[PDB]
Design a protein around this ligand. Structure first.
Ligand SMILES: Nc1nc2c(ncn2[C@@H]2O[C@H](COP(=O)(O)OP(=O)(O)OP(=O)(O)O)[C@@H](O)[C@H]2O)c(=O)[nH]1
Ligand SMILES: Nc1nc2c(ncn2[C@@H]2O[C@H](COP(=O)(O)OP(=O)(O)OP(=O)(O)O)[C@@H](O)[C@H]2O)c(=O)[nH]1
Ligand SMILES: Nc1nc2c(ncn2[C@@H]2O[C@H](COP(=O)(O)OP(=O)(O)O)[C@@H](O)[C@H]2O)c(=O)[nH]1
Ligand SMILES: Nc1nc2c(ncn2[C@@H]2O[C@H](COP(=O)(O)OP(=O)(O)O)[C@@H](O)[C@H]2O)c(=O)[nH]1
Ligand SMILES: [Mg+2]
Ligand SMILES: [Mg+2]
Lengths: 428, 48, 34, 10, 60, 429, 48, 428, 425
């Protein structure tokens, strides 16, 4: 039923802010929290994300987590800043300083008790929670480390509930932190053992879309986070609206995860039209499946063609008939046999929700457990090992209390995971 | 009477699909308004 | 007990001793033709 | 009688 | 804004007393057993009330 | 003719009386001035045409009785017959039985006598209370003793709200219940178990109300009371008086604590979709989820069930329901009671109060059933009491009001005797 | 005649639940408006 | 009299039930508001209201809330329409062991209330898809309870199997192979209703450019209504449920039966064809009419039974049987030279407003056992073997208290089905 | 059922003033003394706290007590000071000066007779006196000393009445008097031997409530006294207003005093929300029970985790369905088994009143006889022992009819109370 969300770090906080703007705009919830929606279906499943107040106001089930208070100030000063619950803004005086150890051991631990307090407070309100969601970036200090601590100690308290992690992952071209390999290696081994499903976001492919797919001259983070919020909305569209072939996030995880450690799906969306091409292209299921599988659309900078799909899933939203959503996603299966691993027949799952987004005849969100994630995994592997051999930047972690053996454990986890993906790619 | 009552357009789902479709602005629309305000800022800088 | 009365009246309905208490149920005393 | 009329009016 | 002044006087939460929900101070008995009862129908009344207006009913 | 005097003791008794009396007034057409003869039972007829209830409200706290006085039913109730004190028992059996209850029992008995002098065919007394509190337990016990010694062998129903197994308002509630059990045994011919959790669950599952309250439970208890008492007021196929089910329900003087179940107790949402046949409603009655006492019947065997039917029920349907319940193995009866059933039929359908959650039903069924299963509530109660009294908890308050220390031990011995008797009567021969 | 009075009773309960809906609608509207003017006056007071 | 209780399980079951019950209402004349040819499916209320003899069962609330908000909300009883709190997420183990167990007791409560309401109840008709979690798990548990409680009561299940190539799940072969054990031992008759043949028939013989779940469920409602019309309305040769089940199933373990229905013709093509009894019987026998994606020519027919509706004449039916005996395309088994039942009813099918079928004076519905149905089981067990050789998705199933031997025992069960179908199709 | 009230000392007088403002606001009375309430219930039991006069003026049944008349001038000059009887103000010339000996023996004794004149007046005037209420602080001289003397003299004359007292307990974090341990030790044994119920308040916890829960920047003594005054109104709300589950002072005493020596309860209130959170809070039984036992709403600076709830009680006010206030509150008993004692099932008691406080749709005040009050008792006894071992500040006390052995007796009684709480802990 209900999904309760947490936003760790500056990246996760801003992306979750845009996510809540998108959800409120879809459900007809004004910044004041009142309802101006145009249909009863919006109120039918508003409890999944929102919690009603006494005055008729709807407040998000959101926890805004950050060791620095500037992000809280910005998110409160945003257009939908007053929508959130004031005590859900949890922050510290001294920031993580882009330090995984500070976010996970010393600075974040002194706040993680209040984090747990508010998490239980939000969880007990829900009648039967479907699960937790966390928006963060693996390259950050408090978004990565403190977010992974959150996931780790929520896994213990709620073992059988879904733990979504929308994690943003960098690329060497977009590398805007010299400690990204350290933080990512230290966060991935936590995500593997504490996350039911993780969704990988890469800014390089978001820039690629904005330059080419959308033809936006100067896109901002208000555009990137908007794109990410689109599919954050899409994944639970089936929870919050009816559909011909309904789905939920637990079913998505079950049908996308063949083995427990292979739960790193790749960000994707459709349609994405430029201003001029909007009135040129006909929007249909055929064009939706055209634009899904093209590498320039799914916005992690790891090429699908460089590997094989383990599993795929398409959450379609809008008015369409199931014959086409079946025949297109079977035609691709037949005509691209070398790009889907053979021992898993019907590599692609379809789900149909009959409620379209804002002003779109139809749309679809694509989730893919493709092998090409091993590209990023191994790349972070060598980028991490190069620094670990020379003991560069390691003194911060050592002085913050993280032992030498834990980094070797992280390397072992990352290398074993890369080998697992390679084995299931080249298996016959 | 079922013919009048059971019209697909009269079913609530068809109504909400139509209203969501005919709603004026998509989110790609504000994506484009981003470029619009960038152009406006550039023009303001040139004027200044 | 009742209120501002000087003292309560000795009601005849009942008494503590079940010997002078008033019980509700006072058991008391052709010829045929032809 | 007036009370009955008012009650009926109510 | 008399309710606003009262709320300012009170430190903690304070709703407008003039609001009908708080202004209605009927008990559970009064709400559930005489839902449409008026103030004049209760036992004790202000002396300004005229007896002619009052209900001259004294039995069931 | 065939009168019945109601005595409402304590706050719970007064609230139950408020509910049952609005129900009685609505059922017999009693309305405020200016707005069949079956109303003789509960109402006295003034020569002026006025109608006065045959109920003594009796409370030691001015709150509930004075609030009724300030309400609209002041016209209905006599200025007297509505006795209120100044100081309550404060959850103290000794305070409500020895110190405060002694000064008001004489007035209560005098008023009861004047009520009874207006009746020539008085069936008996109906005492509504909860033994959880002090005045409900202590003053109720004293009044029951006095009425037993004054009125002889007149039938005396007591509708008692026993503490529920888990939910309990007070912490001394087991003390009050165990102390009042002695009187509720000695001087109560039939005691009706009316705990709160079962009624809450019943009205949650059937009425589909998420917020049941004292008003709702009191309206339901009033419906049960009216269903039990309608047989004499209204003509029916098989009318039963008070003594008629007195005899059919009490096999031994010590075994009279009985449980109730009322159905069809449904809301108007499902009333006009469900088909409430006689057999279906009887099955719903005998289902453990449709009973007013938090005690599974599967933990014992029914000693004697007494069914009350209201409406257009046909005795053929009644007999078919009896036969199917007897055949069903989920309902077990004690071995030495093959008949085990006493059912009565009345032609008067239930009267629905405006604004109530109960929906109108063309027929209704009420239980008064003596079953060996009921020992569970006494087991819970004395399992609370023994650990409470293990090291003298809340005993100084009872001692300081004029009670000897050994009363709690005597009450524990009495409760153990009751549990042993309940286990023994169900034993196979 | 019974079924007719069940129809009538359901009509009255229909009107009653609609009345309850309107009552708590006005109640929560009063909630929101009072609380809005309350924060407005609290901000005015802090300015003061 | 002549009662038959319908139980819908899961999303597919709920949609099939909606499409079936709208047709049943429009056939009996039972109004959408609920206002003795209907006692087969409905219970009369003293207020003149009619309550369907159905029960909606699903662990997730979307479909049941769709029913509760749809046109027939007044018709459907508030109970009998039960919902859970969290779906099975395409997990047989989850729907049969840990989530189905907390709803099965209440489901059987409503089953026995419906049974007590009924008096001449021949049995049950169960609508579900076995490839999904709820339709697999709750179907298995409910059929187990019904078989252990109601003795030899007739149980027919119109079940939607995974189709040979089109599928919308990855664990769908898992669910099918695991629920075949339940459909084999605790189901008197099971009806092959995969979606590929229905979609092909809708696009081919009905001319619908955008076929969808609405259309396929309308067709399945027509098939079910033509199946139950024998005990709904009188006819020349009535064939009740127990009348035809014993003639359909030759062996206790061999009851998996395929279906077809003719004539499915659009309005444009309706007034161009002389739709005689011979025409409809040939059209329903040929490989272009079945709703099951199985080819009877690939095997041999075991026992067929037709059910005509409208102005059909028994002499015409006998002529149809005589002219179908001889064509080489269709061949029966040597041990069943009778091989035919044919029931006739005078009530023609009732087209629904805004529908797709055209108004026809007569129609025929085939339901037939043929040895060729072993090939769909061969396909699904090949899918299962490919699925399980690498132990894919097995962790999800074993995480719900289900041992790893369940898959193996189901595998030899399907192998036994292959063996016995081949054995009974063998000659002498 | 009248509750005749007395306020002693500066602290006691200020909380008494705020309490009288709260009660007059609840019953609709302006400082002029005339009724302006819009409902009948306010006049129904106005006699519980007020007394009628010839012109319909309602005068509080209150006795003001202090040796220093500055607080009398302040209360008279306050907004509601034109309400109390002018002859009910009994004040002396020389203040106690943080001297319990002055407040109890020398300067308070010459004025206790005049106070008992008015107290006997009020008690005789009541139709049926439910009890006495007293408000003071144990850290001061006038408050502690004169309040204990008044409690003793009231006990010697009214044995069967409820001697409710509210005592503001000193804390080291709010230490603003160096003889606070002496005065507290000298007053606690008198309270043990002469009070039915003694509700203890800590300025530290009162401040923390406004720091965190109420989010007040600069809460003043007016605000702290308003909190404690709302609590003091809610403890007796059931006497003045009807409800579906009535209670009174003896009700709470029976339900909250398992043993006679354990009557130092612990104080709380709900709901309490900030000016910022004025909008996001939904008043319901579930939310009230969520804030019910939190330390951020508990108004005594003692950890409830470190003790066991011997008994607890909630004076719920407002219109609410009884099933929730029963089940959602039994949820606490079910899921906090280790917190409560296992030998008393359902340690929580509930009472329902149908009149909520003004400005609140729903409310509840909490009383707890928790064993964690032994922490405060022990942490005051440690200070008393440390100071008295060195014979410190004893000349001021002993020069006024005192002797050394009485301090030792008070210390022994304090330690006995600590051990009594410990053994059932
Ligand atoms: N069914 C029902 N039970 C009630 C009602 N009011 C109180 N009770 C019961 O009374 C029990 C508590 O007893 P008390 O609160 O002491 O009331 P009392 O028994 O009349 O005793 P006093 O308070 O001295 O008047 C609770 O457990 C309730 O079960 C009511 O309105 N309806
Ligand atoms: N005929 C028909 N089949 C459907 C329809 N919707 C879904 N299905 C079938 O259902 C199968 C998958 O099961 P679900 O649709 O998820 O139904 P379910 O498994 O009971 O629902 P969940 O357990 O919550 O997943 C698919 O293979 C479809 O063939 C429909 O509308 N009509
Ligand atoms: N998509 C997206 N990514 C962001 C945004 N802001 C920061 N990032 C990414 O997040 C990473 C930094 O993580 P950050 O949130 O600053 O960690 P923190 O400083 O510990 O909170 C950088 O590599 C950025 O690329 C944003 O608004 N949108
Ligand atoms: N709650 C509250 N406490 C107070 C107030 N004024 C003083 N106190 C406390 O009372 C203690 C002193 O007691 P005091 O009233 O001076 O006693 P007195 O001088 O003998 O009357 C100090 O420790 C203060 O913390 C007040 O207005 N409200
Ligand atoms: Mg009382
Ligand atoms: Mg489903």
């Amino acid at each position: 039923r209900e999904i309760v969300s947490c936003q760790a770090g500056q990246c996760g906080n801003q992306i979750g802010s845009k996510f809540w703007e998108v959800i409120s705009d879809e459900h007809g919830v004004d910044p004041t929290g009142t309802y101006q929606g145009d249909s009863d279906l919006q109120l039918e499943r508003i409890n999944v994300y929102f919690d009603e107040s006494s005055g008729g106001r709807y407040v998000p089930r959101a926890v805004l987590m950050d060791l620095e208070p500037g992000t809280m100030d910005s998110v409160r000063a945003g257009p939908y800043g007053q929508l959130f619950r004031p005590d859900n803004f949890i922050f510290g005086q001294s920031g993580a300083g882009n330090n995984w150890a500070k976010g996970h051991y010393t600075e974040g631990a002194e706040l993680i008790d209040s984090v747990l307090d508010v998490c239980r407070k939000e969880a007990e309100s829900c009648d039967c929670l479907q699960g937790f969601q966390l928006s963060h970036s693996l390259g950050g200090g408090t978004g990565s480390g403190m977010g992974t601590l959150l996931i780790s100690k929520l896994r213990e308290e709620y073992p059988d509930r879904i733990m979504m992690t929308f994690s943003v992952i960098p690329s060497p071209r977009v590398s805007d932190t010299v400690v990204e390999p350290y933080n990512t290696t230290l966060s991935v081994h936590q995500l593997v053992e504490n996350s039911d499903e993780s969704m990988c976001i890469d800014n390089e492919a978001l820039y690629d879309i904005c330059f080419r797919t959308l033809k936006l001259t100067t896109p901002t983070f208000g555009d990137l986070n908007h794109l990410v919020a689109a599919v954050m909305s899409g994944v639970t569209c089936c929870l919050r609206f009816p559909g011909q072939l309904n789905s939920d996030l637990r079913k998505l995880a079950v049908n996308l995860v063949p083995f427990p450690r292979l739960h790193f799906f790749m960000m994707g969306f459709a349609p994405l039209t430029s201003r001029g091409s909007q009135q040129y292209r006909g929007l249909s299921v055929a064009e939706l499946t055209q634009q899904m599988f093209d590498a320039k659309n799914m916005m992690q900078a790891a090429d699908p063609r460089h590997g094989r799909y383990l599993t795929a899933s398409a959450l379609f939203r809008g008015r369409m008939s199931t014959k086409e959503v079946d025949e297109q996603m079977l035609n691709v299966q037949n005509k691209n046999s070398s790009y889907f691993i053979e021992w898993i027949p019907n590599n692609i799952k379809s789900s149909i929700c009959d409620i379209p987004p804002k002003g779109l005849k139809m749309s679809v969100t694509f989730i893919g457990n493709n092998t090409c994630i091993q590209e990023m995994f191994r790349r972070v592997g060598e980028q991490f090992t190069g620094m670990f051999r020379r003991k560069a930047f390691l003194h911060w972690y050592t002085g913050e209390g993280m032992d030498e053996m834990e980094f070797t454990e992280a390397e072992s986890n990352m290398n074993d995971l890369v080998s697992e993906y390679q084995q299931y790619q080249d298996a016959t | 009477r079922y013919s009048e009552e059971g019209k697909q357009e009269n079913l609530p789902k068809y109504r909400t699909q139509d209203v969501f479709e005919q709603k004026g602005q998509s989110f790609l629309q504000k994506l484009y308004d981003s470029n619009a305000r960038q152009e406006e800022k550039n023009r303001e800088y040139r004027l200044e | 007990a009742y209120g501002g009365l000087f003292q309560d009246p000795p009601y005849l309905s009942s008494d503590l001793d079940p010997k002078k208490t008033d019980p509700y149920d006072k058991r008391d005393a052709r010829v045929p033709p032809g | 009688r007036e009370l009955m009329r008012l009650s009926a009016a109510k | 804004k008399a309710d606003v002044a009262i709320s300012m006087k009170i430190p903690y939460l304070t709703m407008a007393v003039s609001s009908d929900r708080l202004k209605d101070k009927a008990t559970v008995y009064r709400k559930d057993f005489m839902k449409d009862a008026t103030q004049a129908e209760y036992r004790s009344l202000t002396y300004k009330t005229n007896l002619e207006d009052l209900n001259p009913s004294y039995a069931y | 003719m065939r009168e019945a005097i109601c005595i409402h003791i304590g706050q719970a008794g007064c609230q139950v009386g408020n509910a049952c009396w609005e129900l009685f007034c609505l059922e017999h057409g009693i309305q405020p001035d200016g707005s069949d003869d079956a109303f003789n039972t509960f109402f006295s007829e003034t020569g002026a045409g006025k109608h006065v209830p045959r109920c003594l409200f009796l409370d030691l706290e001015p709150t509930v009785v004075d609030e009724v006085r300030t309400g609209t039913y002041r016209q209905l109730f006599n200025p007297e017959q509505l006795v209120s004190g100044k100081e309550d028992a404060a959850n103290n059996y000794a305070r409500g039985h020895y110190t405060i209850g002694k000064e008001i029992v004489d007035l209560a008995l005098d008023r009861i006598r004047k009520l009874a002098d207006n009746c020539t065919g008085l069936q008996g007394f109906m005492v509504f209370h909860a033994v959880g509190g002090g005045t409900g337990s202590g003053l109720g016990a004293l009044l029951l003793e006095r009425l037993s010694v004054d009125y002889g062998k007149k039938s005396k129903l007591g509708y008692t709200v026993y503490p529920s197994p888990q939910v309990s308002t007070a912490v001394v509630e087991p003390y009050n219940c165990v102390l009042s059990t002695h009187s509720l045994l000695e001087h109560t011919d039939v005691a009706t178990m009316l705990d709160n959790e079962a009624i809450y669950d019943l009205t949650r599952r059937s009425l589909d109300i998420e917020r049941p309250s004292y008003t709702n439970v009191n309206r339901l208890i009033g419906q049960v009371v009216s269903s039990l008492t309608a047989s004499l007021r209204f003509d029916g196929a098989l009318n039963v008086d008070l003594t008629e089910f007195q005899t059919n329900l009490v096999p031994y003087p010590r075994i009279h604590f009985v449980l109730t179940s009322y159905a069809p107790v449904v809301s108007a949402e499902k009333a006009y979709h469900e088909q409430l046949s006689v057999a279906d409603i009887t099955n719903s009655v005998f289902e453990p989820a449709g009973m007013l006492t938090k005690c599974d019947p599967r933990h014992g065997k029914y000693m004697s069930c007494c069914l009350m039917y209201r409406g257009d029920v046909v005795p053929k349907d009644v007999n078919a329901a009896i036969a199917t319940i007897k055949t069903k193995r989920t309902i077990q009866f004690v071995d030495w009671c093959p008949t085990g059933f006493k059912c009565g039929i009345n032609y008067q359908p239930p009267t629905v109060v405006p604004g109530g959650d109960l929906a109108k039903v063309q027929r209704a069924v009420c239980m008064i059933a003596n079953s060996t299963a009921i020992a569970e509530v006494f087991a819970r109660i004395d399992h609370k009491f023994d650990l409470m009294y293990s090291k003298r908890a809340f005993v100084h308050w009872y001692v300081g009001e004029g009670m000897e220390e050994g009363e709690f031990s005597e009450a524990r011995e009495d409760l153990a005797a009751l549990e042993k008797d309940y286990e023994e009567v169900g034993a196979e021969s | 005649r019974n079924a007719s009075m069940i129809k009538t009773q359901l009509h009255e309960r229909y009107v009653e639940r609609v009345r309850r809906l309107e009552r708590h609608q006005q109640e929560q509207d009063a909630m929101s408006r009072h609380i809005e003017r309350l924060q407005m006056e609290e901000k005015a007071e802090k300015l003061r």
